[PDB]
Design an enzyme around this catalytic site. Structure first.
Site, PDB file in Angstrom:
ATOM      1  N   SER D 155      40.388  39.006  42.029  1.00 41.61           N
ATOM      2  CA  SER D 155      39.030  38.426  41.204  1.00 41.61           C
ATOM      3  C   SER D 155      37.973  39.251  41.127  1.00 41.61           C
ATOM      4  CB  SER D 155      38.528  37.275  41.681  1.00 41.61           C
ATOM      5  OG  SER D 155      37.547  36.596  41.036  1.00 41.61           O
ATOM      6  N   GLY D 156      37.756  40.335  42.177  1.00 37.71           N
ATOM      7  CA  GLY D 156      36.698  41.008  42.359  1.00 37.71           C
ATOM      8  C   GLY D 156      37.190  42.165  41.456  1.00 37.71           C
ATOM      9  N   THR D 160      36.766  39.205  34.249  1.00 34.50           N
ATOM     10  CA  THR D 160      35.772  38.557  33.664  1.00 34.50           C
ATOM     11  C   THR D 160      35.093  39.561  32.503  1.00 34.50           C
ATOM     12  OG1 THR D 160      34.389  38.871  35.399  1.00 34.50           O
ATOM     13  CG2 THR D 160      35.152  36.645  35.121  1.00 34.50           C
ATOM     14  N   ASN D 202      39.339  37.569  50.599  1.00 31.86           N
ATOM     15  CA  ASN D 202      38.683  37.789  49.373  1.00 31.86           C
ATOM     16  C   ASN D 202      37.757  36.345  49.226  1.00 31.86           C
ATOM     17  OD1 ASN D 202      37.765  38.759  47.111  1.00 31.86           O
ATOM     18  ND2 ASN D 202      39.410  38.425  45.757  1.00 31.86           N
ATOM     19  N   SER D 205      38.184  33.883  45.207  1.00 30.36           N
ATOM     20  CA  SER D 205      39.452  33.832  44.609  1.00 30.36           C
ATOM     21  C   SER D 205      39.646  33.033  43.594  1.00 30.36           C
ATOM     22  CB  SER D 205      40.406  33.847  45.796  1.00 30.36           C
ATOM     23  OG  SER D 205      41.855  33.632  45.342  1.00 30.36           O
ATOM     24  N   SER D 206      40.529  33.226  42.500  1.00 32.05           N
ATOM     25  CA  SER D 206      40.795  32.421  41.403  1.00 32.05           C
ATOM     26  C   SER D 206      41.918  31.854  41.858  1.00 32.05           C
ATOM     27  CB  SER D 206      40.794  32.987  40.100  1.00 32.05           C
ATOM     28  OG  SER D 206      39.571  33.362  39.735  1.00 32.05           O
ATOM     29  N   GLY D 428      46.794  38.442  40.985  1.00 36.18           N
ATOM     30  CA  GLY D 428      47.648  39.429  41.357  1.00 36.18           C
ATOM     31  C   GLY D 428      48.566  38.888  42.609  1.00 36.18           C
ATOM     32  N   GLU D 430      49.929  38.853  46.169  1.00 26.38           N
ATOM     33  CA  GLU D 430      49.137  38.468  47.378  1.00 26.38           C
ATOM     34  C   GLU D 430      49.625  38.460  48.775  1.00 26.38           C
ATOM     35  OE1 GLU D 430      46.727  34.337  48.574  1.00 26.38           O
ATOM     36  OE2 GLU D 430      46.116  35.601  46.892  1.00 26.38           O
TER      37      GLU D 430
END
Ligand SMILES: Nc1ncnc2c1ncn2[C@@H]1O[C@H](COP(=O)(O)OP(=O)(O)O)[C@@H](O)[C@H]1O
Ligand SMILES: [Mg+2]
Lengths: 371, 139, 7, 747
Positions: D155-156, D160, D202, D205-206, D428, D430
């Protein structure tokens, strides 16, 4: 694809799809024929009736049960029951998806073979299996260690199971059942001057037994009490609206499981066979069998039978053993609930007898692949 | 080499003696060999010197007699042209590119050495006739 | 059954 | 072999995974002397070989298929130099655009640049996200089959930002004005608050796949957008490991428990609720939860969810929290009771508007019914707990679907959609120290998707071979279907999990014994650790991942007793809750089976469409801009599958050269006696001298295809020949100048 589960009784047949939680079709496994000359013409009546047909029209009919003591007595009647089961009530083509069938232990070897043969040749079922009823009740009650008292029509048996191992030498079969309670109940009813002489009122005696009979927690004090006062008497409407009234006789009938001397049967009662079945086990497991003691099948539905069982085995159990009775309200269906979940396990899918293997091997495959 | 050759070579060697002891430095050995017509690579010079370490290479002094076996060992056209044709095929070579490769690849030389050898050979566009430059440097 | 009983 | 003086090789180093070393003396058939920044001689010693380095011409080129040696160090070095020394953030690995997060704001997204990229062929420009978007847009116009853009990373990584700019590009090049971009961007704070979580490794996280369909009319104006979601991690709602949290919205509520609006919710702090408390990590430092609630409500109001519906949402969520605190006394082995006037249940029933006397009964009993009759049966305390948690997960999933349906209700647009372009945001691959069902799902989804990516690249490189008449037999396919068959199929690791979910007295202990009995020495991708009988290893496409079975059944079990849904559906106090359950086996299905079906729906969506891929990378853990930690970026490159993609690519013909450019470069090697009038047969003769075997390369109509390595071999022989010519020239010049200086002493 989904398997069919049909628990086949000796008075009642229970069928449905695997993964259902209760069967879609239940009816008495009963076949009827008209015993009379017809008056009308152009009525278009049909030769013979199955299940809720033969229940509805029973006054016109003679009724036969094709299964007695878990043995299929006339295949040519039973095939009608299965044909009604798959086609008429279920609305299923049995050629599409496999089927699971349930049987009492230790019944004749030919029964399995001939039921397999009829399934593969007549119904063309793609795959089949048969399972010992007493196993399925442990799947249903959620346990891997059990001793199981399974009674319906036809048969009673004990089977010990510990952590998924059966103990064949300890299987006790006992030919006492709801049919034999009913036949005794007719004779005891005659003592009050009510007489039931043919199958069409044997079907009434069964319903009287189902609603009114119950088990005395201790028999002889309540025998004296009911002789002493009418407080235990209760009454029932026949179909014609005759009230009939029944007293100590209503507990006196379901007692006979505990004293088969009343029927003139030689064996001890279900309590002593349950105890002897435990004692035939080796002592490492008896302590666990005393806790996991499980009621199953309809003949165990009488009110009080759990308490009478707990007391009468407690009198035989060494007093340190905190014996415990498990009697869930579903238990009339527990065999079917167990066959439902068993047939849904992915691990089971290997187990089926496929038509390829049957055509390779013939009916004798059953003894080899099955339990 | 005959006596006359040995005399001319000894005289030349003594001309490189900047201390008067009749000797040159290791670092002059290459100068003497090239001034006398040899064209050895730096690797060949270090090999005939025995791959000396820096300290003796810069300060140890040797007379003519030790040099002579080295001169012998070192002593014992179409490729040169193709080598120049590498950097062309109209017969020219950029002055910038030749300068860069000579000062940055191989046994890199200084920009001043390259300017000295290249002086007068490049035109106003900055192109070198390499056949003429080669004939000049081989004469 | 076939012997010791009616079935 | 052919390691020689002035070769370059990489030392494996602990600190920064690779460091450059120069080969100081030639190799002959166990110890190398090497030259290094730490010393002109340092020595290196060899196991019973060093990764050879690419030539200077190749390094820094925009496309990592151009390089001749394909290695973790070579890829890492190319991305490192491009990012650090040139501040270039986009790279190609083939089809895949790789975006390295700049984490600093940049002018590269200006409209001048949109104009520069629009209308181009992709293969001409330097890589940029617009060059992906334009290839999608043109393929959508050039042929019927529409297009989808798959964005994957942490997510980092900047998903977006890359969706924002992809939509900006689509709108601008379409020449559409309307309100479609701004609402999609404004949607994100709610979709995070409901859908986004704090994992141990993280933050933010999504935990779901978000799919946005940008819809186009017959004229390719933007009409509007349609959102879908998939793969939601339902189990996080009710169980979290150490220093995780569940979804942010519960903490945004508990942080907001002070406000007058929420006094009716009788909330506490996040240690007060069993669902929040378990992680032991109530506060994320640096997050202003109290205002992030407001940033959520603003987004709700911009989309158009009424304040009544917003108070409905937040009262349902407080419902879930209060439900979680209801606690069961065991009456017996197979009976339970809720205690008298039990406070959490009292509050739950007052929030939800249902009769306490019904909830207390139905939470503690199950209804069994058949066509003749119905039985009520008591249930063990464990079953009651599991059913409560399944009810909570079912409420939450329905609320999520409802909010996403109102988002679509806002974004939907009247015109008929001629076609659409998908933007898919998906997590992604994990992996963690302690590894659990959630990651087993995430990795199953990544395996399923990577099979599509392999189909895609294989098909395109059957086309590009036909375009050059090269025989298909030379390209061979690499298949991950033997792993997907292990995970999904019957007797697979999910199927045995679901089967023990129902088998009597099933447990995490016995489940692993079933796994070992079924797979251990039968299927080469399943392995067992030496030290443990409670864990197992799956050799994924990317990695061996070790999973641990504790709590692996309990997370899988979802079953809901319909009578509790029916009770909540009969609520009368407020409107939303009956709305949630508008329309069985869905109540029977486990979380694993619901996931496997959600993923089938996703794959059936993507398989309808022509994919394009993006991979996104986080250069460091510490948010430093324009710094590139090789230790982190190597893990991120493996986790994005980019290194395994490259490892597959290096098996075939990575490096491909137009005959004229090859001729132009390597004429230096070419004897002018040989060289013809015609370039192509010249090259075909020269190369036949320069390489040992034909099979090592191929001749196409318009291009030469080389295997890995051999273009660096041609650069080696080019450099050795050219430097030998420089030796001859330079020794001639040195000797002539020294000779002149001797004459100068004579002069
Ligand atoms: N509720 C009941 N109370 C007493 N007897 C019952 C009850 N239900 C069924 N029975 C008796 O038990 C027999 C049916 O039980 P069941 O378990 O269906 O046998 P099976 O399944 O082997 O046919 C019949 O004799 C019936 O009269
Ligand atoms: Mg039975």
């Amino acid at each position: 694809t989904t398997a069919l589960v049909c628990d086949n009784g000796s008075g009642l047949v229970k069928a449905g799809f695997a993964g259902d939680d209760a069967p879609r079709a239940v009816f008495p496994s009963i076949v009827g024929r008209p015993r009379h000359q017809g008056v009308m013409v152009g009525m278009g009546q049909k030769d013979s009736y199955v299940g809720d047909e033969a229940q509805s029209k029973r006054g016109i009919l003679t009724l036969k049960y094709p299964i007695e003591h878990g043995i299929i007595t006339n295949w040519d009647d039973m095939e009608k029951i299965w044909h009604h089961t798959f086609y008429n009530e279920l609305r299923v083509a049995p050629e599409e998806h496999p089927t699971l069938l349930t049987e009492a232990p230790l019944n004749p070897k030919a029964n399995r073979e001939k039921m397999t043969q009829i399934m593969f040749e007549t119904f063309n079922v793609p795959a089949m299996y048969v399972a010992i009823q007493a196993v399925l009740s442990l799947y249903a009650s959620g346990r891997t260690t059990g001793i199981v008292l399974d009674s319906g029509d036809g048969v009673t048996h004990n089977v010990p199971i510990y952590e998924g191992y059966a103990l064949p030498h300890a299987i006790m079969r006992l030919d006492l059942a709801g049919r034999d309670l009913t036949d005794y109940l007719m004779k005891i009813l005659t003592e009050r001057g009510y007489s039931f002489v043919t199958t069409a009122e044997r079907e009434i005696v069964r319903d009287i037994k189902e609603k009114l009979c119950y088990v005395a927690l201790d028999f002889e004090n309540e025998m004296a009490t009911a002789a002493s006062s009418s407080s235990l008497e209760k009454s029932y409407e026949l179909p014609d609206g005759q009230v009939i009234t029944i007293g100590n006789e209503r507990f006196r009938c379901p007692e006979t499981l505990f004293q088969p001397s009343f029927i003139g049967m030689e064996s001890a009662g279900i309590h002593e066979t349950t105890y002897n079945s435990i004692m035939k086990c080796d002592i490492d497991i008896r302590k666990d069998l005393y806790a996991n003691n499980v009621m199953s099948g309809g003949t165990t539905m009488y009110p009080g039978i759990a308490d009478r069982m707990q007391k009468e085995i407690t009198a035989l159990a060494p007093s340190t053993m905190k014996i415990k009775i498990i009697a869930p309200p579903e238990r009339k269906y527990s065999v079917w609930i167990g066959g439902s979940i068993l047939a849904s396990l992915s691990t089971f899918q290997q187990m089926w007898i496929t038509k390829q293997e049957y055509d390779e091997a013939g009916p004798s495959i059953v003894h080899r692949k099955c339990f | 080499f005959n006596k006359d050759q040995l005399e001319e070579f000894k005289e030349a060697f003594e001309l490189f003696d900047r201390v008067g002891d009749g000797k040159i430095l290791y670092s002059q050995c290459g100068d003497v060999m090239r001034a006398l017509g040899q064209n050895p690579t730096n690797a060949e010079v270090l090999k005939v010197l025995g791959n000396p370490k820096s300290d003796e290479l810069k300060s140890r002094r040797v007379d003519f007699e030790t040099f002579l076996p080295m001169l012998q060992a070192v002593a014992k056209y179409e490729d040169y042209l193709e080598g120049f044709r590498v950097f062309d095929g109209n017969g020219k070579v950029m002055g910038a590119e030749l300068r860069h490769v000579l000062t940055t690849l191989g046994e890199k030389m200084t920009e001043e050495e390259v300017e000295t050898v290249l002086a007068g050979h490049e035109d106003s566009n900055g192109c070198i006739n390499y056949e003429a430059f080669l004939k000049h440097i081989l004469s | 059954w076939x012997a010791x009983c009616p079935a | 072999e052919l390691y020689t003086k002035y070769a370059r090789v990489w030392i494996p180093d602990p600190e920064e995974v690779w460091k450059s070393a120069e080969l100081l003396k030639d190799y002959k058939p166990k110890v190398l002397q090497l030259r290094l920044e730490e010393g002109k001689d340092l020595e290196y010693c060899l196991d019973p070989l060093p990764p050879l380095r690419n030539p200077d011409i190749l390094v820094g080129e925009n496309d990592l298929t151009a390089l001749s040696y394909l290695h973790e160090p070579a890829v890492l070095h190319n991305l490192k130099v491009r990012f650090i020394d040139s501040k270039l953030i986009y790279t190609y690995c083939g089809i895949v655009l790789v975006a390295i997060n700049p984490y600093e704001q940049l002018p590269i997204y200006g409209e001048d640049i949109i104009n520069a990229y629009s209308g181009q062929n992709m293969g001409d420009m330097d890589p940029h996200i617009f060059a992906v978007a334009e290839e999608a847009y043109k393929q959508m116009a050039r042929d019927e089959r529409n297009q989808s853009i798959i964005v994957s990373g942490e997510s980092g990584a900047g998903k977006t930002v890359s969706a924002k700019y992809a939509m900006r590009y689509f709108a601008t090049v379409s020449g559409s004005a309307a309100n479609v971009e701004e609402k999609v961007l404004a949607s994100n704070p709610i979709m995070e608050s409901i859908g986004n979580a704090k994992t141990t490794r993280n933050d933010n996280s999504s935990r779901f796949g978000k799919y946005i369909e940008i819809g186009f009319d017959k004229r390719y104006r933007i009409i509007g957008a349609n959102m879908r979601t998939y793969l939601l991690e339902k189990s996080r709602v009710v169980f979290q490991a150490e220093e995780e949290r569940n979804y942010h919205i519960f903490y945004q509520l508990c942080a907001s428990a002070a406000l007058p609006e929420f006094k009716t919710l009788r909330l506490g702090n996040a240690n007060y609720f069993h669902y929040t408390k378990q992680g032991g990590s109530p506060v994320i430092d640096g997050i202003d939860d109290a205002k992030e609630m407001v940033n959520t409500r603003q987004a709700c109001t911009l989309l158009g969810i009424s304040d009544s519906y917003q108070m409905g949402i937040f009262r349902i969520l407080a419902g879930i929290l209060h439900l979680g605190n209801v606690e069961f006394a065991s009456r017996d082995s197979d009976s339970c009771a809720i205690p008298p006037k039990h406070d959490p249940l009292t509050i739950f029933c007052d929030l939800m508007g249902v009769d306490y006397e019904e909830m207390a009964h139905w939470l503690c009993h199950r209804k069994l019914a058949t066509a003749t009759e119905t039985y009520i049966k008591p249930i063990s305390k464990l079953h009651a707990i599991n059913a409560r948690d399944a009810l909570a997960k079912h409420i939450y999933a329905n609320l999520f679907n409802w909010i996403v349906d109102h988002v679509n209700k806002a974004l939907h647009s009247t015109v008929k959609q001629h076609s659409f372009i998908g933007v898919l945001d998906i997590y992604g691959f994990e992996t963690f120290e302690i590894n659990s069902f959630e990651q087993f799902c995430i990795n199953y989804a990544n395996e399923k998707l990577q099979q599509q990516f392999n189909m895609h690249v294989f098909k395109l490189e059957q086309e590009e071979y036909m375009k050059e008449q090269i025989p298909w037999t030379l390209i061979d396919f690499y298949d991950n279907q033997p792993c997907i068959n292990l995970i999904e199929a019957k007797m697979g690791v999910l199927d045995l999990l679901d089967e023990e979910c129902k088998m009597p007295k099933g447990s995490d202990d016995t489940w692993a014994q079933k796994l070992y009995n079924t797979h251990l020495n039968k299927c080469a991708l399943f392995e067992k650790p030496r030290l443990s009988n409670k864990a197992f290893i799956i050799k994924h496409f990317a990695d061996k991942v070790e999973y641990q079975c504790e709590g692996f059944l309990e997370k899988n079990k979802d079953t809901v007793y319909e009578e509790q849904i029916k009770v909540l559906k009969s609520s009368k106090k407020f409107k939303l809750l009956p709305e949630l359950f508008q329309d069985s086996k869905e109540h029977k299905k486990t979380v694993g089976h619901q996931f496997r079906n959600s993923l089938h729906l996703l794959m059936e969506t993507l398989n309808a469409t022509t994919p394009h891929y993006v991979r996104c990378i986080k250069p460091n853990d510490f948010k430093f801009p324009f710094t590139f930690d090789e230790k982190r970026a190597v893990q991120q490159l493996r986790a994005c599958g980019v290194l395994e993609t490259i490892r597959i690519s290096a098996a075939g013909f990575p490096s491909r050269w137009t005959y004229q450019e090859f001729f132009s470069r390597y004429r230096v090697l070419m004897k002018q006696k040989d060289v013809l009038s015609d370039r192509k047969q010249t090259c075909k003769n020269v190369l036949e001298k320069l390489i040992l075997d034909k099979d090592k390369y191929q001749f196409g109509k318009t291009k030469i295809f080389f295997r890995a390595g051999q273009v660096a071999y041609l650069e080696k022989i080019r450099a050795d020949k050219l430097r030998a010519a420089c030796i001859r020239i330079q020794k001639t010049i040195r000797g002539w100048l020294m000779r002149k200086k001797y004459m100068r002493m004579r002069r």
